[PDB]
Design a protein around this ligand. Structure first.
Ligand SMILES: Cc1cc2nc3c(=O)[nH]c(=O)nc-3n(C[C@H](O)[C@H](O)[C@H](O)COP(=O)(O)O)c2cc1C
Ligand SMILES: Cc1cc2nc3c(=O)[nH]c(=O)nc-3n(C[C@H](O)[C@H](O)[C@H](O)COP(=O)(O)O)c2cc1C
Ligand SMILES: CN(C)c1ccc(C(=C2C=CC(=[N+](C)C)C=C2)c2ccccc2)cc1
Lengths: 216, 219
């Protein structure tokens, strides 16, 4: 074809179990298939954070960032610093070039798996996703939309317990800091607080995901 | 005055989550000052340092779920694979090292409104059912008793009061998990405002260091 432009969607998952053993992954796959049937041509790339190199910010990264500030190039870094920065570049560039993001995270001790924090630490880079201005920082990503699907044993979406929903709230905060302010949230909650009605909660969340896909 | 349970040496855990040292980190410089002041008040208390950037902190992954599945089935430690045995043992080491301690000190910087990811993996190594918490008919309840925790955080801006405290996710999430495992009292020291006010960087650091020395006399 003469034109190669298309909407790029990133299906970012952070759950070790598959869709058959995870409520979050089950609703995540239902939203993706419903989005594909509504949006052909659009590309959907899956990113499993448990099988993706996500370097944590450590002494090598600070040392690598320091040499970059001193005007030095990539060759000045050690081999260990080179492999970490390159993997951080790939994660950042792939996220910046996409248009739609879909996060699937389970709640482990009031927050997400730790690899989600390292992944966000790979995305928040000054000069790339946000810039400093006279009136504080400003996110750089424009024309982006994000969906977060979180599965929790208890119920956190409504009530006072939304204050301890740290995984959901911190993800929304970082997304807005890099310019992704148009977000959507689908809660898959209560399958373990009341196991007798866990399948109804899953089925209701699937219907909630299939409706959002036609307008997302 | 005593004559109850012998001496009972107080174990203190100085848990750091910053790759830089005290010379290149405000939170570490305040954390090191608190320890030096605590050791002078209690010369016989044991202080064990745990650097999370140089400690095996296994993340909950596919091997951990497969291990917990075989443990719940009735099998023992002889059924796991070599990758599962190494991960489960290192989680028990971090768990029992934390449980056997009476005092806890955390030093973290704010990286994008939260802590480094290794802190979350370390907290997931501690919240274990039947060990640090259990579920009752009235709800979950922690099991650790007689513990006192202190969190030192260094942030560029100010997140102590107002609507900016709601986005201090690193401090708040650490308090919730510590309170979930029984440690209901976690004092907090803020080294904040160095990047918002670069001219007050040394004034804020020096004031927070003196605050940590005064707190070390009663902690
Ligand atoms: C290590 C661990 C920690 C958990 N912590 C919480 C929690 O803090 N609050 C909660 O409601 N459920 C908690 N759960 C239960 C999960 O939220 C529940 O399994 C949910 O369905 C997410 O699983 P899934 O995304 O794989 O479907 C925890 C489960 C595990 C294994
Ligand atoms: C990767 C990174 C992310 C940061 N994110 C924030 C932030 O979200 N809010 C803030 O006030 N400061 C932020 N800072 C600045 C540090 O929190 C601040 O300089 C703090 O003093 C660093 O802690 P330390 O000196 O003890 O290492 C960030 C710094 C880095 C390197
Ligand atoms: C069986 N039942 C009625 C329940 C037992 C426990 C829980 C909860 C919970 C909190 C923290 C957890 N963590 C940290 C593992 C796990 C569960 C819980 C979740 C949200 C609000 C209040 C409590 C909900 C229902």
């Amino acid at each position: 074809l003469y034109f190669q432009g298309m909407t790029k969607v990133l299906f970012i998952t952070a759950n070790p179990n598959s869709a058959e053993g995870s409520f979050g992954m089950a609703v995540g796959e239902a939203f993706i298939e419903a989005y594909k049937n509504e949006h052909p041509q659009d590309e959907v790339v899956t990113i499993d954070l448990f099988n993706t190199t996500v370097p944590a910010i450590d002494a090598d990264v600070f040392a690598a960032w320091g040499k970059f500030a001193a005007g030095e190039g990539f060759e000045a870094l050690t081999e260990a610093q080179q492999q970490k920065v390159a993997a951080m570049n790939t994660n950042l560039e792939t996220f910046m070039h996409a248009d739609r993001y879909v996060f699937v995270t389970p709640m482990w001790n009031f927050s997400y798996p730790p690899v989600v924090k390292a992944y966000l630490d790979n995305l928040a880079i000054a000069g790339k996703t946000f810039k400093y201005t006279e009136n504080g920082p400003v996110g750089l990503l424009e024309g982006k939309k994000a969906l977060h699907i979180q599965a929790t044993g208890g119920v956190y979406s409504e009530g006072a317990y939304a204050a301890v929903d740290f995984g959901r709230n911190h993800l929304k905060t970082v997304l807005g800091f890099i310019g992704v302010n148009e977000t959507e949230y689908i809660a898959v909650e209560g399958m373990n607080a009341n196991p007798e009605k866990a399948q109804e909660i899953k089925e209701a969340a699937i219907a909630n995901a299939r409706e959002l896909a036609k307008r997302f």
